[PDB]
Design a protein around this motif. Structure first.
Motif, mmCIF file in Angstrom:
data_model
loop_
_atom_site.group_PDB
_atom_site.id
_atom_site.type_symbol
_atom_site.label_atom_id
_atom_site.label_comp_id
_atom_site.label_asym_id
_atom_site.label_seq_id
_atom_site.Cartn_x
_atom_site.Cartn_y
_atom_site.Cartn_z
ATOM 1 N N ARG A 39 -3.743 2.981 -10.100
ATOM 2 C CA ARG A 39 -4.928 2.745 -9.281
ATOM 3 C C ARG A 39 -6.139 2.423 -10.147
ATOM 4 N N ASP A 63 -2.316 5.639 1.104
ATOM 5 C CA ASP A 63 -1.909 5.039 -0.166
ATOM 6 C C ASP A 63 -2.381 3.593 -0.303
ATOM 7 N N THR A 64 -3.452 3.226 0.396
ATOM 8 C CA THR A 64 -4.010 1.883 0.336
ATOM 9 C C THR A 64 -5.517 1.969 0.137
ATOM 10 N N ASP A 101 -9.001 7.112 0.032
ATOM 11 C CA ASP A 101 -8.836 8.543 -0.185
ATOM 12 C C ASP A 101 -8.290 8.822 -1.582
HETATM 13 NA NA NA Z 1 -3.922 5.643 -2.947
#
Ligand code: NA
Length: 259
Positions: free
Chosen positions: A166, A191-192, A189
């Motif tokens: 990330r 998972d995107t 936050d």
């Molecule tokens: Na993420």
């Protein structure tokens, strides 16, 4: 007297964001005649100097950015099979028979670059060293319930293997939008991630593996992000509506062609 609503729509078509004039007590014919002369001179300056289209020039500027950073330039078909969309997790009539431009009983217009780039990631892993870095710029199509462009240009870059974190993904997005000169903010936050510009979604990035990777021969870590080029041009040039930056016969580089 007062300008009608239709007269205001007409003047807004001939109105450039760089114009510093207010819509002054002058009649509609006087205001229209002034904006027409400005837009004609604007096109004359383009025809005598740059002569490059905003969409095409942006694709070339983006291509130089990723080619210089080790990304392979991909030119996959725009007409993709319907089985590619069924394999993306879409069926029935939720999004399969609603926002998809089908051509034949087997093919359709690609709504995204992910399926083609996924197949390239699988095939290129047999020949290229780790990591695999590719990208593509091309047209995409999606109907409409909503309100957005149906014909648009997408940019999708992705990396597979090592370094697919990330932190690394956000560093590429940050260096990319700072290169163009577009203000943004990363929201995340699911998972995107979401790359926003105030209230407009510039991109939706995906980090790490996805359970869908097994259906595309992908078993390595990967990161990627997809940018719409029309939305980028709207931000850089401060266009009030995104249709001034899309493929059209009505506008050239945000300048009205109905003069
Ligand atoms: Na993420």
């Amino acid at each position: 007297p007062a300008l009608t609503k239709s007269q205001t729509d007409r003047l807004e078509v001939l109105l450039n964001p760089k114009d510093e004039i207010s819509l002054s007590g002058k009649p509609f014919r006087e205001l229209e005649s002034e904006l027409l002369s400005r837009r004609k001179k604007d096109l004359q300056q383009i025809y005598a100097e740059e002569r490059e289209n905003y969409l095409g020039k942006l694709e070339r500027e983006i291509t130089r950015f990723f080619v210089d950073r080790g990304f392979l330039e991909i030119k996959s078909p725009i007409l993709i099979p319907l089985e590619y969309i069924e394999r993306m997790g879409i069926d029935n009539d939720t999004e399969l028979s609603k926002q998809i431009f089908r051509v034949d009983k087997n093919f359709c217009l690609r709504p995204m670059l992910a399926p083609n780039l996924a197949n390239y990631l699988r095939k290129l892993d047999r020949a290229l060293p780790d990591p695999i870095k590719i990208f593509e710029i091309g047209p995409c199509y999606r109907k409409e319930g909503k309100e957005h462009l149906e014909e648009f240009t997408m940019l999708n870059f992705c990396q597979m293997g090592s370094g697919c974190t990330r932190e690394n993904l956000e560093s590429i997005i940050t260096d990319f939008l700072n290169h163009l000169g577009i203000d943004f903010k990363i929201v995340g936050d699911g998972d995107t991630l979401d790359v926003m510009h105030g209230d407009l979604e510039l991109s939706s990035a995906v980090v790490g593996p996805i359970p869908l990777d097994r259906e595309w021969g992908i078993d390595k870590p990967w990161i990627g992000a997809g940018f719409g080029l029309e939305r980028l041009l709207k931000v850089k040039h401060d266009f009030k509506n995104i249709k001034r930056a899309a493929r059209s016969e009505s506008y050239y580089n945000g300048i009205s062609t109905n003069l």
